[PDB]
Ligand binder design. Sequence first.
Ligand SMILES: CCCCCCCCCCCCCCCC(=O)O
Ligand SMILES: [Cl-]
Length: 133
Amino acid sequence: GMSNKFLGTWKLVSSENFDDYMKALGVGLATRKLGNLAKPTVIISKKGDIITIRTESTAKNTEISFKLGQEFEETTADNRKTKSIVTLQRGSLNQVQRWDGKETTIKRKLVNGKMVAECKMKGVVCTRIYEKV
Ligand SMILES: CCCCCCCCCCCCCCCC(=O)O
Ligand SMILES: [Cl-]
């Protein structure tokens, strides 16, 4: 299952192309501003076979818990109600969210000790880099 090196508290240090990604998701302007300003903390933890990803920012927190490979209901930070599945592919922790026949992926991998998240909607790609605190 998931590498223990994912477990811990992660802080955003770099974001690329997040605004166009949020536009692809249908996010409104007020919320995009929040998203472009935020420098969230992402906390990855595991208990039994359940992984939890908790995101904290000044303006919004989110939290998901899941078993690898098992679909679950999710309410995203921009208030989409999705059905989501997290898988593991060659060390990459990959989240797919589906709603209304739409799909977006968030792939989280470790690179030189940093967590790199690739976000993709309709071919629009962003890259968000985190340092482990
Ligand atoms: C805490 C996020 C900031 C708040 C902005 C809310 C509107 C956009 C959120 C939708 C997708 C977020 C994907 C995050 C990927 C990551 O963990 O880097
Ligand atoms: Cl913040």
